[PDB]
Design a protein around this ligand. Sequence first.
Ligand code: NAD
Ligand code: NAD
Ligand code: HCI
Ligand code: HCI
Ligand code: K
Lengths: 347, 349
Amino acid sequence: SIDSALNWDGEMTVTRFDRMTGAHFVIRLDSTQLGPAAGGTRAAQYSQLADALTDAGKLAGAMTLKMAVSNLPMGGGKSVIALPAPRHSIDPSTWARILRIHAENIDKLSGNYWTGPDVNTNSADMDTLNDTTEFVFGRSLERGGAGSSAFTTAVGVFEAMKATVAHRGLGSLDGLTVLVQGLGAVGGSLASLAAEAGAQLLVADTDTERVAHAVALGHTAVALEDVLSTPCDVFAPCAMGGVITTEVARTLDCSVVAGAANNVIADEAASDILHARGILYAPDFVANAGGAIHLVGREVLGWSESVVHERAVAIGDTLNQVFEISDNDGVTPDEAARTLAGRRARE
Amino acid sequence: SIDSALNWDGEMTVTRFDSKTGAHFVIRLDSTQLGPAAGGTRAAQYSQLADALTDAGKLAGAMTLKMAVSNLPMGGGKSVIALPAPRHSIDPSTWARILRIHAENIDKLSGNYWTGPDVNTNSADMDTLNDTTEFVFGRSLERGGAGSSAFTTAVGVFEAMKATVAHRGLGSLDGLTVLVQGLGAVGGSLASLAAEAGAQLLVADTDTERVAHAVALGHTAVALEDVLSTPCDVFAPCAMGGVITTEVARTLDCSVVAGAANNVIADEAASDILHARGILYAPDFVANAGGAIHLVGREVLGWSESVVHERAVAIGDTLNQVFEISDNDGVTPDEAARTLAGRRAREAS
Ligand SMILES: NC(=O)c1ccc[n+]([C@@H]2O[C@H](COP(=O)([O-])OP(=O)(O)OC[C@H]3O[C@@H](n4cnc5c(N)ncnc54)[C@H](O)[C@@H]3O)[C@@H](O)[C@H]2O)c1
Ligand SMILES: NC(=O)c1ccc[n+]([C@@H]2O[C@H](COP(=O)([O-])OP(=O)(O)OC[C@H]3O[C@@H](n4cnc5c(N)ncnc54)[C@H](O)[C@@H]3O)[C@@H](O)[C@H]2O)c1
Ligand SMILES: O=C(O)CCc1ccccc1
Ligand SMILES: O=C(O)CCc1ccccc1
Ligand SMILES: [K+]
């Protein structure tokens, strides 16, 4: 929206347009209070510019809280690339140009912002980015990066998922029905984990091959259009965000909500509804923090692979504290989560 | 439209919104090819955000040219602070907050952008900015800044007028009728120099004591509303920019245009009209370079005041060259000058 686009209260907004490629660049820094901002680089096609600005803004926020509640020394920031065409259609030469300019933009910030991979960006691109700028996390192992953080991400979400399931009074994942939306990098990892832990897997993905294979493995396919209406014990949104609107909140058929996506909840009211409906949601910003722990832990703090792994598992604990507060003070988890980040940031 | 405002070719646009003050902040970086971008801080009230945006960019564009054509090792940028109320209604407190917030943004660019005083901004505000950021030009003298660029600006503008008038075929400024619009820091001083050169002065200004004053000095005042309908030899727009519209370009009654204002031309066609009507125009980005010359010259280049002076004066020289291009090439002075800025830029590499 316009509010969310023009009247954003973050510390800085950076924009740029390239006539050559017709692409627009957005870099939103929400907070640099606890450290330089850091956030991925999402590249995607938006209906309107304002949608691009909105997204960069909501994500940047999530980043800020995510870093604070996870005890990372950094601020929240985010970069959005409004593509002129679908990522897959972009030609190599353009992709590269676009990447080049983006990198130029980061370099201007001079360490006030550090990027990494997000939707449609990868370790190879980071490497590419790194040819112009230094403010990059997630470059491939060969270039000196910590590489991909999906796994750390998925591990975090699994631990989180387990913590949520226990709290809700469902016992263990054993014999529970888990619905995974989005079988990507993280999504697909998380399914392996849950399956292995005794859960029945219901899966959905825009990608048929993805789906086909999960089916191969003994999973159950869900038509994209039956997703939000499909009964489960747990709902794992691991695809795009803004998935839970006020209307979805009142109709979802589950007891738990735990996934990897950023910004799952569209409106504040939705979050109240789930709550009111006896649906235990684990805050996205807590749950999906394994990727940040990984990049920051490794690249910034120099943590080994194990520590990072162990810190990501500790995500479950954070949740337990979140759950304790929400339960004590009578707030939603979301709020409860917001409360603990604030306390950890020592605000 | 914002979208449209966003369809700009600058290297970078920085924006921020301050809930508390309700102030919007803009920083447009046109080019950092010759060096860090630099340009003043304009504080004003905008109708829309898209407006502030278009301005900062228009201005940022002018700066890139001014640096280049003036043989300055810098790029161009401009900050625009969109006010939530008129400058005068802003409480010293809010203003200080706004300044600080301003200063943080600048800080984020870490040297890629150097600022200075512009409209509604002064040495003092620069001193304050300086409390937070270090990339400020035009700080008080005692703060270590080079102070006020006004007088150098006027000298430069002055020198340009003379050369222009001369090329026109008006000979000297002696006996001519000069119409000075806006007698601020710059115009005030220009009137003064024009006066002693023998010119006759018509003056105009919203400030009535400034007008009262010029009147007492022999000068003839002019009604605001009659500013563009007054016949003169030279028109010196020393207040707001974009005063030259297509419609105004066609009815203007003078033989030369030479002022201090940025973005005099409100439109392309206007420059063609004047050119075709035989009204000789000294391109703004060329003639108003006196201030950048001073600031950079002293604060970056470490130049002597005397040297800065020769350079501000050398502005005529550059205009002679501009004219020449315009005359041989068959182009408006506007075009002849961007060209020159273009050449100097390349040779400068
Ligand atoms: N470290 C991470 O990788 C990480 C960290 C934090 C949060 N997140 C969030 O996780 C989400 C993506 O995770 P990822 O990197 O594994 O993704 P990815 O880009 O590999 O995931 C794409 C997956 O989503 C699927 N998908 C897209 N739209 C879908 C839809 N409507 N229904 C079903 N499947 C759909 C694709 O087909 C594919 O399987 C985003 O919101 C991202 O911001 C991920
Ligand atoms: N270094 C400089 O000072 C500098 C350098 C480059 C270009 N310029 C350009 O020169 C102009 C002069 O600004 P300045 O720094 O001398 O500021 P200033 O505030 O001292 O001068 C503006 C003056 O013009 C008057 N004015 C404003 N609106 C008017 C109107 N509608 N009609 C008539 N007069 C009006 C004001 O009363 C004031 O006295 C600006 O447009 C600026 O963009 C100045
Ligand atoms: O948390 C996310 O969704 C993205 C993680 C991240 C963290 C730091 C830099 C880039 C991406
Ligand atoms: O020429 C101008 O518009 C103003 C002079 C200036 C130069 C460098 C930085 C700020 C202002
Ligand atoms: K169970």
